[PDB]
Amino acid sequence: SNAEELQALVDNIPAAIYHLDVSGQATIRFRPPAFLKTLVSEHAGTTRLNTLSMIHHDDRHMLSNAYSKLREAKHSLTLVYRIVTPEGKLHWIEDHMRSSFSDDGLFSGIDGILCEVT
Amino acid sequence: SNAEELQALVDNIPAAIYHLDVSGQATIRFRPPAFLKTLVSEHAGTTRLNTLSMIHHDDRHMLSNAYSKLREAKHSLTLVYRIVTPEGKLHWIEDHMRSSFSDDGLFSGIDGILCEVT
């Protein structure tokens, strides 16, 4: 898939941006893709993805339909939808999703890889 | 440079791994390169790079010499050195470093990009 390809590619690059401060402390710098720079939040020392509140209104029923499908069965799907940001920028998203389940057949969340289409 | 090339490449990939939990909360997953998996620490919700304590003993004077150079002048340098991990694994590192300074001509730390050589 257009997006799986991409990440299989990030996973092979053995590179890491770091910053070393004056006191000798090296901290790894993690940057989301540029377009995502403004679309994420800090919470509990973890990066949040605010992208779901941004789905274009005409793309919402589709997306939600896909969620129901994944919630009830172990699927992989690829979705394309638009998002509109706070600052009115429009982006086409390719979003690959994989459903997951607990040992007990319980739904345990979704693992995704998303990219901008251009 | 061997490593600058690499990251210029990560910076262009508009892909992001995320996890969406059962309560609707999407968190971006940040993974260091595999070899680095075991070589980083969690601290203050930020990832630490424990790689400097691992420099091979025969590579230490060199590296430290480079630090003195960067500390006194805005330089970019590329260093290659070995590290030995807790579990005795040996890795060749290419490490590109850029010196930085405060408005007042004060040394303000080092910005680097490092990769495994193979």
Among residues B61, B56, B53, B51, the alpha carbon closest in space to that of B95 is found at B51
CA B93 to the chain's CA centroid:
10
Asked if the Cβ–Cβ distance from A15 to B51 is below 8 Å, we say no
Q: Are A33 and A7 in contact (CB under 8 A)?
A: no
Cα angle vertex B37, ends B33, B39, to 5°?
A: 115
Asked if the Cβ–Cβ distance from A28 to B15 is below 8 Å, we say no
CA A111 to the chain's CA centroid:
9
Q: In what order do the strands lie in the sheet with B90-101?
A: B40-43, B46-49, A26-28, A15-20, B107-116, B90-101, B76-84
The Cα–Cα gap between B109 and A55 comes to 40
Shortest CA gap A71–chain B (Å): 9
Entry resolution (Å): 2.7
- Other C-beta atoms closer than 10 Å to the C-beta of B116 total 19
Per the entry, the structure determination technique was X-ray
Shortest CA gap B32–chain A (Å): 7
CA A113 to the chain's CA centroid:
5
Q: In what order do the strands lie in the sheet with A40-43?
A: A40-43, A46-49, B26-28, B15-20, A107-116, A90-101, A76-84
The Cα–Cα gap between A93 and A116 comes to 5
The Cα–Cα gap between A18 and A101 comes to 35
The Cα–Cα gap between B4 and A20 comes to 17
Chain A residue numbers with beta carbons less than 8 Å from the beta carbon of B33 are 13-16
Q: What is the DSSP letter of B105?
A: S
Q: Which DSSP helix (H) or strand (E) runs through B62? A: helix B60-72
Q: Regarding the domain with residue range A1-118, which homologous superfamily does it belong to in the CATH classification?
A: PAS domain (3.30.450.20)
Which residue in the set B9, B26, B46 is minimally distant from A13, CB to CB?
B9
Q: What is the DSSP letter of B63?
A: H
> Could you give the C-alpha distances from A111 to A4, A50, A108, in angstroms and in order?
12, 16, 10
